[PDB]
Symmetry: D2
Subunit: 121 residues, 4 copies
């Protein structure tokens, strides 16, 4: 299992120790408070009122937690995933990333604390 | 395992099928959007800017998800719990509840979708 | 989880730290060598050639590992149980017992090493 | 998870659907009766009285269940493995095999029924 922090201003994302392999079932729980610029902060589902202006993940709100598995496209994580299996052909290291517009991470603040484990399968 | 919705306006809380027994390890993931009255909605961590005016759980924000186990006091759940063990002497059915002030649930809206499972132990 | 030895000559059985609760899923693996009297020894499935002359469990061979859950009747364990759920209304402490005829345990020898854990549910 | 039979006369072994990956925790439970030639049958720990005359696994008795993971050497399974982690650098498909001397499998009989699952990690 892995536990760590994902900083909102880390555009490259936070690599974890988790390698997702075919057939794996995983659980993720994410908590905490972060911002994509404003003084306000949002949880790992992000800001439901803010328009998408070029987010790295168009399937989650700005300020949400997302991930990549190997070199997949971004996949929403939000508050977490319960006993989840990846789409076919998706495998490799899990990288966690705050959802913002590329080039605009410098004014971000806060972080999410995230646990990831593999479940029985 | 249990999956279901917890309505923000349900003051009695949502009983689940999960009975927490001594030694159990559990995982909860909660998602969604709810309000304790305002037109805005918040995720399962609630509204970090709103003062506590007599919440059923003083250890979580207004609008957060909390629980009771048997007839315990309220315990914060927020976005979820990862491979969690209860305090000594806490056991019984898990009831999930939206954190608001007693008597003020009528103007609440939305709900959280919640998964709960028992982990290996 | 519990790990321990079950002595072949222990007529009362070996109490474990595992309380089986409704809905629990458990796994048991048992290993080792024991005898109900002869110089030979047998593994946890017992002696497939020996007649049942009044065994505590008529659904397993003499010399097999069996169990009780609370005050249930005996249930075969043999080499183990994989992600197993008990019958309806069966619950309580797990006691492991070598299968022999009551009153005839004094000439028994050896033991089984046994792991028991609860699985995800 | 995988469930299947491992025939005692199958010299090449039984390939399973389980690919053991770095960091995986697995559980195996094996049951049943088989023989390496004699009319008698033994359980998955094999025959503790028979000399090793060139077995594929010198760390288990003749007639025991063993495995390979990818192209590893043989590893004893016996009655099973509880929440087990492989040695460093061992990975790949799990193949289950009856322990006998190469070239002598033709007079073998019976089989073991085996479950393998991945555990939480
Ligand atoms: Ca920004
Ligand atoms: Ca309200
Ligand atoms: Ca005896
Ligand atoms: Ca043979």
């Amino acid at each position: 299992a892995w536990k760590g922090e994902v900083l909102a201003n880390n555009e490259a994302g936070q690599v974890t120790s988790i390698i997702y392999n075919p057939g794996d079932v995983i659980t993720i729980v994410a908590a905490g408070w972060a911002s994509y610029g404003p003084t306000q902060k949002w949880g790992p589902q992000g800001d439901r009122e803010h328009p998408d202006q070029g987010l790295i993940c168009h399937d989650a709100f700005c300020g949400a937690l997302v991930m990549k598995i190997g070199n997949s496209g971004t996949i929403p994580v939000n508050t977490g995933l319960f006993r989840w299996v990846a789409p076919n052909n998706v495998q490799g290291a899990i990288t966690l990333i705050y959802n913002d517009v590329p080039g605009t991470y410098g004014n971000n603040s806060g972080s999410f604390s995230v646990n990831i484990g593999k479940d029985q399968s």
